[PDB]
Design a protein around this ligand. Structure first.
Ligand SMILES: *[C@@H]1O[C@H](CO)[C@@H](O[C@@H]2O[C@H](CO)[C@@H](O[C@@H]3O[C@H](CO[C@H]4O[C@H](CO[C@H]5O[C@H](CO)[C@@H](O)[C@H](O)[C@@H]5O)[C@@H](O)[C@H](O[C@H]5O[C@H](CO)[C@@H](O)[C@H](O)[C@@H]5O)[C@@H]4O)[C@@H](O)[C@H](O[C@H]4O[C@H](CO)[C@@H](O)[C@H](O)[C@@H]4O[C@H]4O[C@H](CO)[C@@H](O)[C@H](O)[C@@H]4O[C@H]4O[C@H](CO)[C@@H](O)[C@H](O)[C@@H]4O)[C@@H]3O)[C@H](O)[C@H]2NC(C)=O)[C@H](O)[C@H]1NC(C)=O
Ligand SMILES: *[C@@H]1O[C@H](CO)[C@@H](O[C@@H]2O[C@H](CO)[C@@H](O[C@@H]3O[C@H](CO[C@H]4O[C@H](CO)[C@@H](O)[C@H](O)[C@@H]4O)[C@@H](O)[C@H](O[C@H]4O[C@H](CO)[C@@H](O)[C@H](O)[C@@H]4O)[C@@H]3O)[C@H](O)[C@H]2NC(C)=O)[C@H](O)[C@H]1NC(C)=O
Ligand SMILES: *[C@@H]1O[C@H](CO)[C@@H](O[C@@H]2O[C@H](CO)[C@@H](O[C@@H]3O[C@H](CO[C@H]4O[C@H](CO)[C@@H](O)[C@H](O)[C@@H]4O)[C@@H](O)[C@H](O[C@H]4O[C@H](CO)[C@@H](O)[C@H](O)[C@@H]4O)[C@@H]3O)[C@H](O)[C@H]2NC(C)=O)[C@H](O)[C@H]1NC(C)=O
Ligand SMILES: *[C@@H]1O[C@H](CO)[C@@H](O[C@@H]2O[C@H](CO)[C@@H](O[C@@H]3O[C@H](CO)[C@@H](O)[C@H](O[C@H]4O[C@H](CO)[C@@H](O)[C@H](O)[C@@H]4O)[C@@H]3O)[C@H](O)[C@H]2NC(C)=O)[C@H](O)[C@H]1NC(C)=O
Ligand SMILES: *[C@@H]1O[C@H](CO)[C@@H](O[C@@H]2O[C@H](CO)[C@@H](O[C@@H]3O[C@H](CO)[C@@H](O)[C@H](O[C@H]4O[C@H](CO)[C@@H](O)[C@H](O)[C@@H]4O)[C@@H]3O)[C@H](O)[C@H]2NC(C)=O)[C@H](O)[C@H]1NC(C)=O
Ligand SMILES: *[C@@H]1O[C@H](CO)[C@@H](O[C@@H]2O[C@H](CO)[C@@H](O[C@@H]3O[C@H](CO)[C@@H](O)[C@H](O)[C@@H]3O)[C@H](O)[C@H]2NC(C)=O)[C@H](O)[C@H]1NC(C)=O
Ligand SMILES: *[C@@H]1O[C@H](CO)[C@@H](O[C@@H]2O[C@H](CO)[C@@H](O[C@@H]3O[C@H](CO)[C@@H](O)[C@H](O)[C@@H]3O)[C@H](O)[C@H]2NC(C)=O)[C@H](O)[C@H]1NC(C)=O
Ligand SMILES: *[C@@H]1O[C@H](CO)[C@@H](O[C@@H]2O[C@H](CO)[C@@H](O[C@@H]3O[C@H](CO)[C@@H](O)[C@H](O)[C@@H]3O)[C@H](O)[C@H]2NC(C)=O)[C@H](O)[C@H]1NC(C)=O
Ligand SMILES: *[C@@H]1O[C@H](CO)[C@@H](O[C@@H]2O[C@H](CO)[C@@H](O[C@@H]3O[C@H](CO)[C@@H](O)[C@H](O)[C@@H]3O)[C@H](O)[C@H]2NC(C)=O)[C@H](O)[C@H]1NC(C)=O
Ligand SMILES: *[C@@H]1O[C@H](CO)[C@@H](O[C@@H]2O[C@H](CO)[C@@H](O)[C@H](O)[C@H]2NC(C)=O)[C@H](O)[C@H]1NC(C)=O
Ligand SMILES: *[C@@H]1O[C@H](CO)[C@@H](O[C@@H]2O[C@H](CO)[C@@H](O)[C@H](O)[C@H]2NC(C)=O)[C@H](O)[C@H]1NC(C)=O
Ligand SMILES: *[C@@H]1O[C@H](CO)[C@@H](O[C@@H]2O[C@H](CO)[C@@H](O)[C@H](O)[C@H]2NC(C)=O)[C@H](O)[C@H]1NC(C)=O
Ligand SMILES: *[C@@H]1O[C@H](CO)[C@@H](O[C@@H]2O[C@H](CO)[C@@H](O)[C@H](O)[C@H]2NC(C)=O)[C@H](O)[C@H]1NC(C)=O
Ligand SMILES: *[C@@H]1O[C@H](CO)[C@@H](O[C@@H]2O[C@H](CO)[C@@H](O)[C@H](O)[C@H]2NC(C)=O)[C@H](O)[C@H]1NC(C)=O
Ligand SMILES: *[C@@H]1O[C@H](CO)[C@@H](O)[C@H](O)[C@H]1NC(C)=O
Lengths: 105, 364, 128, 132, 87, 128
């Protein structure tokens, strides 16, 4: 589940099973070696300190995988990404989504 | 067109609401017209099969009891030798357990097999104008403050009455005909207990009723030419059907009906509205139809007040049934087929049907 | 004809709950109300309630709410649609309620009201 | 300014109760919810559980009995007690703060909503491993 | 019912396409527990293939079951004289 | 109401064959004829044909015989008997026939003829 785009372009990294109800996904980053770090804490807003270029798909769409859209990729984005999804029909997820990392040229 | 409302002078007609004609005739007419509108639709005798049900794909909380079950079962094809394993969704008020493992059956299979209403026909009321035959006349009492029994000093003859929408509502009669100036109560004998008190008020209170799931209907072919419309998947979230009434307008209309009802019991009496006492589900709760779906909406949020001698909304929940037993006959149902999309209907409550309590013991 | 038969007499304990049956036969059960009245010695009659067995809408007396409960059971049969059962589940039984209990039905004439109870059950005495 | 300090043995023998503590900086423990995050090597991390005073101490129902979480009001810490060290829990561990928040999708009075969590800030991790 | 059809006892030439098929199938008896294996002849414009082996079904079974005309009645035209009513 | 929806625009090769759908909804389909007309640029309108969808009897223009073909598909369903589909399989496509193609239906008044085409499809342009 690796993806590699040239630096400066855009990328769509996807995760999670198809959507059943309304969902409030969250999105995590893991630079190799260190602790993780929060990226998106709802569908489409991020905490302070975490910049822009981290846009996400909304949760209101039904029957839609949980994606994360980046524009203007750079070498700092060379890390691991994770979805942690909270579907309002399927029960709560005590384990994260599948590890789908991203490296740049 | 232009029905001849002809006024008459110097006439005192003795009207009576309660020993009237034209109502048992209308009731027999509407139930016979109900019966004739189901004969060409299909019969569901091949569906009384042992269903294997389970819970819907949902985060089941223990306090909230799910009103949907996911039931799969064998069913014949149009080819009589072969059978198919199909699945559908039913409401918990339509299936019953047969006794570990879980097996369900429909609620009516030990009483009567019954008819899916063929969904080209619809259930909204259209106005019916009753007309007298030749050699008969229809009188209309044009008085305003007319409680419904006795002399009416201003009558008028009509060839054909105005638009009567036949609605089926149990309490809180909807889409009715308003009053003129006041809120009018009426009874046959108000000091009796067994006779209902009919209340009709002047300005209506609007009510917004919805179910917010979108069912996807699917066609399961039973045999040659006969299809059965089942509920497929719920896309999006599952939620409970409900209705909204404006709180300030409801409080104002209850204030008006208390100010009217104090004229018959003394002014210094404390009027207390309580919820329904009990019985079957079609009388304990507000039952109606909305776009071809039968709602049973709880009513304890409205009829709960105590009135002494001196932008918010009320949300009241509902439960919906697919198998009805309207008019309470012995061998009938109607399996109402599901409707695609979310369902919203806006109507205007014009009246109420009340009942006193048969009080002894020094009750103030 | 019209018959109203009840269940036999019972002896219960204070705080328990009695359940009185009332089987009606000989008329179309889904039409006429069924009233329940009691007879306490040395206090005269006292009404309890009524039930319309088409749907099951009830009404109880004001001094007995939260104690009494009435159900009905129709005859889902197209061969004998006449018979039917009414019930009373009288709970909160105290030593004052030693009495006789009748289930009655109104007359069938046109100018009969609802309260002129014509047909009477045999009555069931409870002693606590 | 917050930064957390995980502390544990690291090398554990099997059939033993793993314990681990988390020293705090900046803010104390009681005023927010805390959570324990496990991550085995080269895969998805899994969430163990989250704690707060007044009964807000739900665990992973997969574990649910093999682990008990606890609080340290006295020393301003928060602890982990694991029981029955298998071969699977050889992983890096994290104590991490969490903030709640309600996703509302229907009528509010019908209990038609839920509470999603998210770990905002993290510690450094502790690579606990089991040997024989 | 799922009919098992075959070709009629005939010198089948490839150019001439036969308008008759010989179809055999189960059918219920008047005794509901037992069934009989019967055979009949149908026209090719009345059966359709269900998809080696060959199995056919009738042409109308996925649209409408339908009625055999009971053959005491006939279909020749008799003359009808239309008449006006009085007035 | 009455709706006539078509299929989307297509680009085909000379000598190939296009197949234009035309779904009609909102009326009893087994009654009224469906006509097919085309619009070539710089030559005005030009009729193609008509089809009576009760049985399927067609009629084509004289200059287009041996190229066009029209079928229909009824709604064998007693629940929505209104909708229906007409088809045109226009074969022998040459570079002159780059055009827009409309499927039309006549009016519903009594003194309406057959050729006063009231209800129109959205039209489908083909380019070869
Ligand atoms: C009978 O009456 C009853 C009651 O009177 C009616 O019941 C109501 O029914 C409706 C119908 O669904 C329910 O609506 C939902 O409401 C939720 C909650 O909204 C509330 O909370 C919002 C946020 O809270 C704010 O305050 C808290 C502190 O209190 C703070 O912590 C928080 O951070 C935030 O600051 C408020 O914004 C919201 O206000 C809304 O309404 C105001 C009214 O005038 C208006 O002024 C505001 O501008 C705003 O519009 C309200 O207070 C909604 O969140 C929910 O909508 C989401 O979910 C549905 C389904 O999932 C989806 O279709 C919607 O599009 C929406 O999804 C967006 O929001 C998600 C939030 O995370 C987001 O994740 C999604 O991706 C999506 O994001 C959108 O915005 C983002 C930017 O954030 C953007 O990037 C995206 O592209 C996208 O555009 C529903 O609307 C009511 O809750 C319910 N009850 C009540 C009490 O009203 C009943 O309907 C009546 N029946 C009839 C028949 O009339
Ligand atoms: C009511 O209950 C019924 C009975 O269970 C449910 O119907 C089943 O729902 C499940 C959902 O999990 C379906 O399972 C999915 O099947 C896919 C294959 O599709 C075909 O497979 C069957 C044979 O098994 C065919 O007969 C049929 O025609 C299907 O078209 C799989 O690909 C799916 O895999 C899922 O998981 C993997 C890994 O987890 C993911 O990668 C996939 O993307 C996918 O999400 C899955 O196994 C099953 O097909 C349904 N059965 C039928 C008969 O439809 C209803 O959903 C339920 N209703 C409600 C409202 O809850
Ligand atoms: C449509 O298709 C069906 C199915 O095949 C045909 O029906 C069969 O036709 C064959 C013709 O070959 C019949 O076979 C003959 O059966 C005779 C015995 O009669 C009884 O036997 C069966 C059991 O097998 C009983 O159930 C039944 O009641 C019969 O009454 C044999 O004696 C015949 O032998 C022939 O060959 C020998 C040697 O070759 C000769 O010496 C004989 O004289 C004779 O010619 C033969 O085997 C078979 O019985 C039919 N079955 C049924 C159920 O009727 C239809 O013919 C066909 N229709 C058309 C129009 O083609
Ligand atoms: C799917 O549904 C489950 C329920 O079936 C739901 O789990 C519950 O979520 C809530 C909030 O996420 C948990 O938190 C509770 O919140 C209230 C309000 O603060 C507290 O009072 C609770 O404390 C007690 O209640 C619990 C009830 O059993 C006790 O188990 C608990 O130990 C406390 O004594 C508590 O903090 C709640 O604990 C869970 N319940 C369970 C059993 O997990 C879940 O969130 C839903 N998930 C999704 C994605 O919809
Ligand atoms: C049963 O039906 C078969 C056909 O399914 C039939 O067999 C054919 O009979 C005719 C006459 O008996 C054969 O003769 C042909 O006659 C014409 C006219 O002269 C010739 O042009 C034919 O020459 C060519 O046609 C054949 C067609 O396949 C070629 O196979 C052949 O090699 C020549 O190229 C030919 O002379 C004809 O050949 C047969 N066909 C076969 C396949 O046997 C048979 O007679 C019928 N029997 C009964 C009892 O009804
Ligand atoms: C649809 O029809 C089929 C066919 O009858 C039903 O399947 C049957 O289900 C029963 C269980 O109730 C099976 O019996 C079991 O068989 C197994 C052997 O596989 C045996 O080990 C068990 O002890 C038990 O006897 C039965 O075999 C099975 N038949 C077939 C052909 O599979 C099915 O229940 C019906 N409903 C649905 C929703 O599929
Ligand atoms: C009219 O209003 C009253 C009070 O608001 C309602 O009474 C309450 O009804 C609920 C539902 O039946 C009762 O809850 C249930 O109690 C039983 C035990 O009897 C329990 O087994 C169930 O799990 C559930 O908890 C509730 O106790 C009851 N409260 C009182 C004080 O009587 C009444 O239902 C309303 N009437 C209608 C028609 O809605
Ligand atoms: C509830 O009932 C009332 C009356 O039964 C509904 O109508 C309201 O009152 C009058 C009477 O129909 C409406 O005026 C009408 O306007 C149309 C168009 O101008 C005109 O053609 C009619 O002859 C008549 O004059 C009035 O518009 C309407 N009120 C509103 C606010 O629209 C009422 O619509 C029903 N529903 C609700 C939700 O109140
Ligand atoms: C009339 O009804 C009978 C009874 O169902 C049908 O016979 C059945 O035909 C099937 C083939 O489609 C048989 O299955 C086969 O069984 C053999 C064992 O003999 C096995 O080796 C094959 O692999 C296949 O499974 C089935 O056994 C058979 N049943 C009986 C009782 O004989 C028959 O097709 C129907 N129609 C006619 C025209 O007879
Ligand atoms: C669906 O199956 C059963 C039947 O509903 C569920 O078990 C009960 O569910 C109700 C709520 O629907 C709870 O109140 C009970 O406590 C449950 N009983 C038991 C023994 O669990 C079950 O929870 C549902 N879900 C699944 C996944 O089976
Ligand atoms: C409820 O379900 C219906 C499906 O029955 C949804 O309709 C779909 O809407 C999208 C967007 O317009 C279309 O692309 C699909 O083609 C529609 N479905 C079908 C079968 O045509 C509808 O949007 C849903 N509504 C909600 C609020 O969930
Ligand atoms: C019932 O539905 C109607 C229709 O939407 C609501 O009327 C709207 O009310 C809002 C809020 O006051 C106004 O902004 C709109 O202009 C109104 N629209 C119309 C067409 O009147 C009404 O408020 C709803 N009633 C309740 C109790 O929710
Ligand atoms: C009945 O009406 C009252 C208001 O007249 C509602 O308010 C509650 O009343 C009960 C006792 O009747 C109190 O115990 C609650 O504290 C009251 N609620 C609040 C928020 O103060 C009551 O909700 C109504 N009943 C129903 C079922 O809606
Ligand atoms: C009857 O069975 C099949 C089905 O008709 C016949 O096979 C085809 O028959 C047609 C004419 O009916 C020929 O045009 C085809 O060329 C035949 N195809 C094959 C693969 O043979 C078959 O010939 C008939 N007769 C028998 C004895 O089976
Ligand atoms: C009670 O109050 C009403 C209010 O108008 C009044 O008409 C009536 O006379 C009063 N009755 C008594 C007995 O005071």
């Amino acid at each position: 589940t690796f993806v590699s785009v040239a630096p400066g372009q855009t990328a769509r990294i996807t995760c999670g099973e198809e959507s059943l109800g309304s969902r409030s996904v969250i999105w995590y980053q893991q630079r190799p070696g260190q602790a993780p770090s929060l990226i998106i804490y709802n569908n489409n807003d991020r905490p302070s300190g975490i910049p822009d270029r981290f846009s996400g798909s909304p949760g209101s769409t039904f029957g839609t995988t949980a994606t994360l859209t980046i524009t203007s990729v750079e070498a700092g984005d060379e890390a691991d990404y994770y979805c942690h999804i909270w579907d309002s029909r399927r029960p709560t997820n005590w384990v994260f989504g599948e590890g789908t990392t991203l490296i740049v040229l | 067109p232009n029905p001849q409302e002809i006024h008459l002078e110097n006439v005192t007609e003795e009207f009576n609401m309660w020993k009237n004609n034209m109502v048992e005739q209308m009731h027999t007419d509407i139930i016979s017209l109900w019966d004739q509108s189901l004969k060409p639709c299909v019969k569901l005798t091949p569906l009384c099969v042992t269903l294997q049900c389970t819970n819907v794909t949902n985060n089941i909380t223990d306090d909230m009891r799910g009103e949907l079950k996911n039931c799969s079962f064998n069913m014949t094809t149009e080819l009589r030798d072969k059978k198919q394993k199909v699945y559908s969704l039913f409401y918990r008020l339509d299936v019953v357990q047969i006794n570990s493992n879980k097996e369900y059956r429909l609620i009516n299979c030990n009483t009567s097999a019954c008819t899916q209403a063929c969904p080209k026909v619809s259930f909204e009321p259209i106005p019916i104008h009753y007309c007298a035959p030749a050699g008969f006349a229809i009188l209309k009492c044009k008085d305003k403050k007319f409680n419904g029994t006795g002399p009416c000093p201003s009558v008028s003859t009509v060839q054909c009455t105005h638009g009567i929408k036949p609605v089926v509502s149990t309490q809180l009669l909807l889409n009715g005909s308003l009053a003129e100036e006041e809120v009018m109560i009426r009874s046959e004998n108000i000091t009796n207990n067994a006779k209902n008190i009919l209340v009709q008020f002047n300005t209506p209170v609007q009510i917004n009723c919805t179910r917010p799931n979108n069912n996807t209907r699917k066609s399961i072919r039973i045999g040659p030419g006969q299809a059965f419309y089942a509920t497929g998947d719920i896309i999006g979230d599952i939620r409970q059907a409900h209705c909204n009434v404006s709180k300030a307008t409801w409080n104002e209309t209850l204030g008006k009906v208390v100010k009217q009802l104090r004229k018959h019991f003394g002014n210094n009496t404390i009027i207390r509205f309580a919820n329904s006492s009990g019985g079957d589900l079609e009388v304990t709760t507000h039952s109606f139809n909305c776009g071809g779906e039968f709602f049973y909406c709880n009513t304890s949020g409205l009829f709960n007040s105590t009135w002494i001698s001196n932008n918010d909304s009320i949300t009241l929940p509902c439960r919906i049934k697919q198998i009805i037993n309207m008019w309470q006959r012995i061998g009938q149902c109607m399996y109402a087929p599901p409707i695609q999309g979310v369902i919203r209907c806006v109507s205007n409550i014009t009246g109420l049907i009340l009942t006193r309590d048969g009080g002894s013991t020094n009750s103030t | 004809q019209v018959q109203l038969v009840q269940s036999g007499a019972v002896i219960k304990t204070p705080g328990s709950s009695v359940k009185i049956s009332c089987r009606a036969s000989g008329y179309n059960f889904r039409d006429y109300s069924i009233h329940w009245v009691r007879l306490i010695p040395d206090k005269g009659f006292e009404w309890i309630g009524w039930i319309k067995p088409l749907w099951g809408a009830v009404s109880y007396a004001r001094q007995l709410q939260g104690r009494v409960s009435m159900t009905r059971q129709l005859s889902q049969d197209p061969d004998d649609p006449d018979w039917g059962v009414a019930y009373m589940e009288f709970s909160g039984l105290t030593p004052a309620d030693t009495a006789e209990y009748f289930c009655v039905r109104r007359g069938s004439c046109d100018y009969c009201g609802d309260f002129p109870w014509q047909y009477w059950g045999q009555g069931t005495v409870v002693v606590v | 300014q917050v930064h957390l300090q995980e502390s544990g043995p690291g090398l554990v023998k099997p059939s033993e109760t793993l314990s681990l503590t988390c020293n705090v900086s900046g803010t104390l423990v009681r005023d927010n919810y805390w959570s324990w995050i496990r991550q085995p090597l080269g895969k998805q991390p899994e969430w163990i559980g989250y704690v707060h005073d007044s009964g807000d101490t739900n665990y992973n129902p997969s574990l649910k009995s093999r682990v008990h979480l606890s609080l340290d009001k006295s020393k301003n810490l928060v602890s982990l007690r694991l029981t029955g060290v298998t071969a699977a829990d050889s992983a890096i561990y994290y104590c991490a703060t969490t903030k709640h928040g309600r996703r509302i999708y229907g009528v509010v009075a019908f209990k038609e909503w839920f509470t999603y969590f998210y770990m905002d800030v993290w510690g450094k991790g502790t690579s606990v491993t089991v040997s024989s």
